[PDB]
Amino acid sequence: DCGLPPDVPNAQPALEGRTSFPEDTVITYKCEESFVKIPGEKDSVICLKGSQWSDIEEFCNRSCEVPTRLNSASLKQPYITQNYFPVGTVVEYECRPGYRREPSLSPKLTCLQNLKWSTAVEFCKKKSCPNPGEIRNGQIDVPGGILFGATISFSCNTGYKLFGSTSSFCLISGSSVQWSDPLPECREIYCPAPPQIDNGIIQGERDHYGYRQSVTYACNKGFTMIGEHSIYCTVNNDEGEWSGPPPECRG
């Protein structure tokens, strides 16, 4: 049997709590922090006859950790599966979903001498959603732009009622940015048909009476009006309600 394996710089043998290794027993060394094993180089020893471990030279070199995860871009091949980032190494990035390349900026990163990657630029910008558009008799609230991940709400002008979603999200869709919900509709809140009064009539009657619109009453010959001569259509909670009671035609 062999005793503990030799000592190797920047590496620590995985003994597994043992002290005595039977012949042929193979022991591998694991590099230390800031150190990654050179590809193709021996990183192991074997206990041979004569209680003699195999030969071995230094096999670890200085390197950067795996590039940090970015929300905008994702590593390309084959860097996406590498771990040995010797100084002076460049990794290439590819815009995520859904982000778009910024021509003027490099999507590559460099492993600096201090085992740190070059501060990443904004090579991958956020994809812009299509213009929310215009809502007839309604409004679009764009709290913070229309970029991917954005949010817009909808409301209706007084007198109109909202029919559909109250909000939309610039969610990721296929190979581009798209709004989660369709542009709703604002429906005119019509009041109930104006009451018909006795001995009177409605001056220039109408088909539909909307918000603020009024109905004017008139008494027939020989009759006298009793009350407010007109009423205006009010709206309360998408509910159309007449200003009040129609006048009265007293004979």
From Swiss-Prot:
Disulfide bonds: C2-C47, C31-C60, C64-C111, C95-C124, C129-C170, C156-C186, C191-C233, C219-C249
GO CC term, one of those recorded: plasma membrane
Keywords: Blood group antigen, Cell membrane, Complement pathway, Disease variant, Disulfide bond, Glycoprotein, GPI-anchor, Host cell receptor for virus entry, Host-virus interaction, Immunity, Innate immunity, Lipoprotein, Membrane, Receptor, Repeat, Secreted, Signal, Sushi
Post-translational modifications reported in the UniProt record: The Ser/Thr-rich domain is heavily O-glycosylated.
Impact noted for substituting R18P: In Tc(c) antigen
Domain Sushi: 1-62, 62-126, 127-188, 189-251
Tissue expression per record: Expressed on the plasma membranes of all cell types that are in intimate contact with plasma complement proteins. It is also found on the surfaces of epithelial cells lining extracellular compartments, and variants of the molecule are present in body fluids and in extracellular matrix.
Entry annotated with the keyword Iron-sulfur: no
Effect of A193P: In Cr(a-) antigen
GO terms of molecular function: lipid binding; virus receptor activity
Family statement drawn from the similarity comment of this UniProt entry: Belongs to the receptors of complement activation (RCA) family.
Purpose of the protein: This protein recognizes C4b and C3b fragments that condense with cell-surface hydroxyl or amino groups when nascent C4b and C3b are locally generated during C4 and c3 activation. Interaction of daf with cell-associated C4b and C3b polypeptides interferes with their ability to catalyze the conversion of C2 and factor B to enzymatically active C2a and Bb and thereby prevents the formation of C4b2a and C3bBb, the amplification convertases of the complement cascade. (Microbial infection) Acts as a receptor for Coxsackievirus A21, coxsackieviruses B1, B3 and B5.
Record remark: domains: The first Sushi domain (SCR1) is not necessary for function. SCR2 and SCR4 provide the proper conformation for the active site on SCR3.
Clinical disorder: Complement hyperactivation, angiopathic thrombosis, and protein-losing enteropathy: An autosomal recessive disease characterized by abdominal pain and diarrhea, primary intestinal lymphangiectasia, edema due to hypoproteinemia, malabsorption, and less frequently, bowel inflammation, recurrent infections, and angiopathic thromboembolic disease. Patients' T lymphocytes show increased complement activation causing surface deposition of complement and the generation of soluble C5a.
Protein name, per record: Complement decay-accelerating factor
Species in which this protein is naturally found: Homo sapiens (Human)
Gene: CD55
